[PDB]
Scaffold this active site. Structure first.
Site, PDB file in Angstrom:
ATOM      1  N   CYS A  85       1.083   3.615   3.014  1.00  0.00           N
ATOM      2  CA  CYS A  85       1.728   3.008   4.169  1.00  0.00           C
ATOM      3  C   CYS A  85       3.232   3.239   4.211  1.00  0.00           C
ATOM      4  O   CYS A  85       3.804   3.227   5.303  1.00  0.00           O
ATOM      5  CB  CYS A  85       1.430   1.510   4.201  1.00  0.00           C
ATOM      6  SG  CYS A  85      -0.294   1.127   4.551  1.00  0.00           S
TER       7      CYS A  85
ATOM      8  N   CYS B 283       0.841  -1.186   0.000  1.00  0.00           N
ATOM      9  CA  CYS B 283       0.000   0.000   0.000  1.00  0.00           C
ATOM     10  C   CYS B 283       0.881   1.242   0.000  1.00  0.00           C
ATOM     11  O   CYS B 283       1.782   1.372   0.834  1.00  0.00           O
ATOM     12  CB  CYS B 283      -0.932   0.000   1.211  1.00  0.00           C
ATOM     13  SG  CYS B 283      -2.112   1.356   1.246  1.00  0.00           S
TER      14      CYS B 283
END
Lengths: 43, 52, 224, 114, 384
Positions: D40, D37
């Protein structure tokens, strides 16, 4: 070798029976000529 | 070299599909029949089977 | 054409020119055939030139007319050969507009804050009461000019002689000089001054350990 | 000794149940990152900075939702980057935050809501 | 019941889009299990998962505010309709909207709640830890009485995403907004962007989204979302199948990625009478499109290894959706001419591609000029 290049857009015209068929150094078909050949360009 | 063999000159002429069209019309074979005939076995067909 | 092909702009080949029909595909050798699908090329897209934006801006202002809506490479090569003529013609039209309008009306282009009437008649009718001659009115008008407006006006400096068209091309037109925004976004390149590099950021290697600390950690070197 | 490069500690879901059931002195921040992600990457750096700034005054930990996906779903996580702030007092409701919240919002929550 | 603005001027030239729901700085709702973790702590290696990504994550969508920003930057006009907290972060999000020239007249401002902060009670059941929401966040708690009807009047597309269905309040507000927009002749765009809880089971999500899906006139679904709403396992077997003896055509020998084009009969369980356009997105790599009258596929591309350090997939799906809306509002022949639809969807493809080349979503949405440049550089002029 010098390259002759079309000075104008248009239609190439010549009697291709006057010239011998050949395979070019690049594998392209071409005509090989041993005369003064006149080529028209219908611009 | 300027090509000399009749067969190579013929191949040079066949390079235009329009010439192939004209050859079709001159020989009279239909153009799908010619597309078939190009797959003909090149030669030396074996002696027929005689099976008894 | 035949007449008035001297002076004014005219189609290089005379109108009513003939056209010709040539070998279709399957009449042609394989090396002289157009491919059955148009091939991708990096060069497929007309290069954006200064000469294209200027020649379009001249066409839209009617100073020139073009054979089509887009200037050909021949036309842009001729503009490249002749642009200074059109530039000096525009500068002359700008001098003549200065002479006609007078300095108040001319330079009020770069004083948005000057709301008063600037025509020569209004300048006279204002001199006939306020006692301020045209010069004092012009000093006042410029006293309302902001620094940014003055810097833009400085294109009209008699030594700079900036092109009246280049001073007035809008952003969406000037963009066509380089060909619009870059495809890869410049925000990827922008970095702040006085930014300090985060060496712990996601595009740095993990901090290299002290060689002694690393050898000790791996129990390769001992202390006592 | 070479000092470890990262402070935010990865937990399994069971080690997290242990850490939530046991008594806590300090706020527990749980990050439900996942490694594919994009946000992230940024949240992991914000949380590393938070984990330095608070030292032992906060317990900041992370749970990879590649491994604990059903636990993330049971935590009502609906996206990543997501973060739970669990009070040391077990009576208080925990706070779930979604998206890259500012590190100052993390400090605000930890100081004023936990 | 009716609402009158008292104005007769024709609004403005790029028709307004209203984007309903939540705003987050950047936030990926679509999350699923992936096969390859990188190192759990070294974020310096997660680039490898933005250039060889999970297939559900090949072009992530995000909050509808991302779509609003991208659509405005692509030259359209967007209003964001939602709610934020009175705290500093709600102000930061509204400032982000305003700086991006997103119109925020429908953005309400709760004073008694903390923007992104959701109150949840942690509980233990079956020995597992669980959470239940004690208070919803502002963005989940916009009321039907807080809708800006001037926006819904002006807005020609009402865009929403399924995350609003995770709040009963926001779901009721959504359906009131849909009623209003349809009354004012709007088109309903439903960008699915299934959040984590809606990947639990096909037949629960299909009934959860049923009313929203049947209200939508236009729908965007990823390949993975469509295959999950259909039989995920059947399409897995469909693409893991390889002929035992010989391929049925030459192309099947090439072992290239399977760009399977779902047939209208396979879409038929999802198709409905109001649906003017369904788009199934396989990254930017392909956009399948379906209409009542024709179906087809825009072949796209991606590159992301062109920018190994700066690339980030995030927001590429939002930029695709924004480009689709950008053309839909200014070329409605998209619903009626197939070549026009393809040529315009290639603009959405180009916008997705450019959006993949920088870290961050809002940081990366392209402009109209950059998008059209990339279209005209990638695609042959025949197919601009």
């Amino acid at each position: 070798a010098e390259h002759v290049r079309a000075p104008y857009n248009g239609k190439i015209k010549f009697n291709e029976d006057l010239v011998h068929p050949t395979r070019t150094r690049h594998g392209h078909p071409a005509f090989l000529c041993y005369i003064d050949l006149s080529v028209i360009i219908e611009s | 070299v300027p090509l000399q063999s009749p067969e190579a000159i013929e191949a040079f002429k066949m390079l235009r599909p329009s010439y192939r069209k004209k050859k079709i019309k001159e020989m009279g074979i239909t153009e799908d029949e010619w597309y078939a005939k190009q797959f003909e076995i090149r030669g030396d067909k074996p002696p027929p089977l005689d099976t008894s | 054409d035949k007449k008035l092909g001297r002076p004014h702009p005219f189609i290089d080949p005379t109108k009513k020119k003939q056209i010709e029909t040539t070998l279709t595909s399957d009449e042609s050798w394989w090396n002289w055939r157009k491919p059955e699908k148009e091939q991708w090329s990096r060069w497929q897209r007309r290069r954006p030139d200064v000469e294209t934006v200027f020649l379009k801006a001249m066409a839209e202002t009617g100073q020139v007319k073009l054979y089509g809506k887009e200037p050909t490479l021949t036309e842009t090569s001729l503009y490249r050969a002749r642009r200074h003529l059109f530039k000096e013609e525009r500068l002359q039209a700008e001098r003549e507009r200065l002479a006609k309008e007078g300095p108040m009306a001319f330079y009020s282009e770069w004083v948005k804050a000057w709301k008063r009437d600037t025509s020569r008649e209004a300048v006279q009718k204002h001199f006939e009461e306020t006692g301020e001659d045209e010069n004092t009115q012009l000093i006042e008008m410029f006293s309302h000019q902001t620094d940014r407006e003055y810097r833009i006006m400085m294109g009209t400096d008699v030594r700079i002689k900036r092109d009246p068209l280049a001073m007035r091309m809008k952003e969406d037109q000037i963009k066509q000089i380089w060909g619009g925004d870059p495809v890869y976004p410049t925000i990827n390149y922008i970095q702040a001054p006085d930014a300090v590099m985060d060496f712990r950021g996601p595009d740095f290697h993990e901090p290299t350990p002290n060689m002694l600390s690393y050898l000790k950690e791996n129990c390769k070197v001992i202390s006592r | 000794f070479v000092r470890e490069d990262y402070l935010v500690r990865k937990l399994t879901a069971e080690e997290l149940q242990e850490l939530v059931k046991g008594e806590r002195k300090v706020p527990l921040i749980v990050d439900f990152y996942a490694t594919w992600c994009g946000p992230c990457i940024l949240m992991a750096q914000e949380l590393e900075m938070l984990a330095v700034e608070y030292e032992s005054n906060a317990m900041i930990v992370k749970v990879d939702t590649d491994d604990e996906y059903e636990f993330a779903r049971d935590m009502q996580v609906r996206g990543l980057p997501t973060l739970f702030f669990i009070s040391p007092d077990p009576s208080k409701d925990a706070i779930r935050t979604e998206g890259l919240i500012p590190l100052q919002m993390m400090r605000d929550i930890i100081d004023n809501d936990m | 019941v009716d609402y009158d603005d008292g104005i007769d001027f024709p609004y403005d030239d790029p028709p307004l889009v209203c984007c309903f729901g939540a705003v987050q700085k950047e936030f990926v709702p679509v999350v699923r299990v992936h096969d390859n973790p990188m190192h759990p702590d070294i974020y310096s290696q997660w680039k490898m998962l933005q250039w060889d990504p999970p297939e559900f994550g090949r072009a992530p969508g995000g909050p509808p505010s991302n779509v609003a920003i991208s659509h405005v930057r692509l030259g359209g006009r967007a209003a964001f309709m939602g709610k934020v907290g009175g705290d500093d972060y709600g102000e930061e999000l509204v400032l982000m909207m305003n700086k991006e020239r997103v119109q925020t007249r429908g953005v309400k401002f709760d004073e008694g709640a903390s923007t992104a902060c959701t109150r949840v009670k942690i509980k233990f059941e079956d020995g597992k830890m669980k959470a239940e929401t004690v208070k919803e966040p502002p963005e989940d708690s916009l009321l039907a009485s807080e809708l800006n009807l001037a926006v819904l009047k002006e807005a020609r597309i009402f865009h929403f995403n399924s995350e609003v269905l995770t709040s009963p309040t926001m779901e009721s507000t959504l359906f009131k907004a849909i009623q209003w927009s349809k009354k004012f002749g709007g088109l309903i765009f439903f960008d699915l962007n299934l959040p984590l809880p809606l990947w639990r089971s096909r037949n629960e999500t299909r009934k959860l989204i049923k009313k929203s899906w049947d209200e939508a006139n236009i729908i965007e679904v990823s390949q993975q979302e469509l295959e999950f709403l259909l039989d995920e396992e059947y399409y897995e077997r469909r693409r893991n199948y390889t002929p035992q003896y010989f391929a049925e055509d030459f192309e099947q020998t090439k072992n290239r990625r399977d760009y399977y084009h779902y047939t209208p009969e396979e879409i038929k369980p999802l198709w409905h009478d109001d649906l003017k356009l369904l788009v199934v997105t396989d990254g930017t790599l392909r956009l399948h499109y379906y209409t009542p009258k024709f179906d087809g596929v825009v072949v796209g591309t991606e590159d992301v290894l062109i920018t190994p350090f700066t690339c980030d997939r995030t927001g590429s799906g939002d930029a695709v959706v924004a480009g689709i809306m950008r053309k839909l509002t200014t070329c409605p022949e998209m619903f009626e001419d197939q070549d026009v639809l393809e040529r315009q969807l290639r603009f959405a493809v180009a916008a997705g591609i450019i959006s993949q080349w920088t870290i961050g979503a809002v940081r990366g949405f392209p402009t109209e000029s950059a998008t059209q440049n990339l279209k005209e550089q990638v695609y042959v002029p025949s197919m601009w």
